[PDB]
Structure 1
Amino acid sequence: MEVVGTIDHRDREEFRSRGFAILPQVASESEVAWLRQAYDRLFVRRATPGAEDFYDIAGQRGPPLLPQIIKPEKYVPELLDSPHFARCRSIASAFLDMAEEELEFYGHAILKPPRYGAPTPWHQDEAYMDPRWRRRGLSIWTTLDEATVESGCLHYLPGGHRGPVLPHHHIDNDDRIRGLMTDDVDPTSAVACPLAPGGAVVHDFRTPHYAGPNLTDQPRRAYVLVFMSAPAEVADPEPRPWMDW
């Protein structure tokens, strides 16, 4: 089918109030079919002579990293001039109350392989950013596959975007590319956001989120679009001693 969902006031209101929103169908099934073909070429599962398969990308070729590609639009420029991109930009504009022309953006691709046992630990995306420069922004996480709690859908801490940027630390201080995590989220307050293919979740830069392991025999592919304002100078920057400069 070629139908796609809409957004209304209620979506925006809940995004502002809770720090995230679910969009059941941000990409049509035909757009999803094309996005899957883009991925099928971006993420090649490759065999070895008698050992384990690996994904033929940077990061995969210590402990395994989540297969990801920053700015996949460099390799597939067809990506960022899709109707799905424009639709997402318009959504970002509505949710951020900023003109589409004011938004800077980039893409990010993720693949959780079958039986991938590592979670994406609790974190806030702003924890990765320079505390000297504040941007308003959000991420639109579009899934190409069914996303369930068992396959690695996102979980959020509702209202956490109006709290502080929580203390983070590197998962491993001698292996910083593994990323950041915080221990300061009460998992009992969390809410999961399962999605059907072509669904998306949207979250503020400051909303804490987590993704479970992929316990299923199927890969779970997400395509993330990040939209943000220009940076503003912060007079009294937070220390963020976990920053990798």
Structure 2
Amino acid sequence: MEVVGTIDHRDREEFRSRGFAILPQVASESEVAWLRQAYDRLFVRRATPEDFYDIAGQRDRGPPLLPQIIKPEKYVPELLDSPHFARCRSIASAFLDMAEEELEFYGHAILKPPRYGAPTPWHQDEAYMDPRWRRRGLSIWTTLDEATVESGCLHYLPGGHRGPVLPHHHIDNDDRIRGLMTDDVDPTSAVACPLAPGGAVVHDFRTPHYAGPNLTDQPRRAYVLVFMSAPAEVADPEPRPWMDW
């Protein structure tokens, strides 16, 4: 099928209120099929005489990292031409109350291997950003596969985008590429967002989120588009002592 869902006022309203939103079908079945074929080539599972995914971060990797490609549109420039990109930019515009032309953007590809046992710990995406420069923005996480709690779908802290950027620390101070985490989210307050293929979740830069391990025997792929404003000077910057400069 080639049908795609729509957004309405209620979608925007709950995004503003809760800091995240579920879009049941942002990519059509045929768009998902094409994205899957693209990932088949981007993420080559390669054998040795343990298999590894033949990308930076994996083939040269301490504990395993989540297989991911920053700005995959460099390798597959067919990506940002797409109706799916345009559709997502329009959604971002509606949700941020900003003209599409004002948005900076980039792509991000993720594959969670079968039986990948590490979670993505609680974090806010803004914790990765320079406290001297504020951007409004969001992420649109489009799944290529069923996403369930057991396969590693995202969980959010509703309303957390109106709270502080929580204290974060490196998972390993001597292995910073593993990323950041916060201990300051109550898991009983979390809400999970399972998705069908072609569905997406959208979240603000400040909404805390977590992803579980992939306890299933099938890879789980997501294509993430980030849309954001130009940076604005912050007069009194937060310390964020966990920042990797």
Cα distance in 1 between the residues matched to 2:242 and 2:124: 13
Cα distance in 2 between the residues matched to 1:24 and 1:181: 28
Report what 2:240 is aligned to.
Answer: 240
Deviation, structure 1 residue 78: 0.2
Deviations 1:11-41 (A, max 9, x none): 0000000000000000000000000011000
SS of alignment partner, residue 77 of structure 1? coil
Deviation, structure 1 residue 129: 0.2
Q: May I ask how many residue pairs the two structures share in their alignment?
A: 243
SS of alignment partner, residue 91 of structure 2? helix
CA-based RMSD: 0.4
Cα distance in 1 between the residues matched to 2:92 and 2:223: 15
Aligned residues with identical type, % of pairs: 100
SS of alignment partner, residue 78 of structure 1? coil
Deviations 1:51-72 (A, max 9, x none): x000000000600000000000
Deviations 1:108-152 (A, max 9, x none): 000000000000000000000000000000000000000000000
Report what 1:150 is aligned to.
Answer: 150
Deviation, structure 1 residue 229: 0.2
Deviations 1:174-226 (A, max 9, x none): 00000000000000000000000000000000000000000000000000000
Cα distance in 2 between the residues matched to 1:171 and 1:88: 31
Deviation, structure 1 residue 87: 0.1
Deviations 1:44-97 (A, max 9, x none): 000000xx0000000006000000000000000000110000000000000000
* TM-score (norm. length: structure 2): 0.99
Report what 2:76 is aligned to.
Answer: 76
Deviation, structure 1 residue 169: 0.2
2:194 paired with 1:202: no
Cα distance in 1 between the residues matched to 2:17 and 2:228: 19
Cα distance in 2 between the residues matched to 1:134 and 1:38: 34
Unmatched runs of 5 consecutive residues or more in structure 2: none
Cα distance in 2 between the residues matched to 1:37 and 1:84: 16
Cα distance in 2 between the residues matched to 1:115 and 1:176: 23
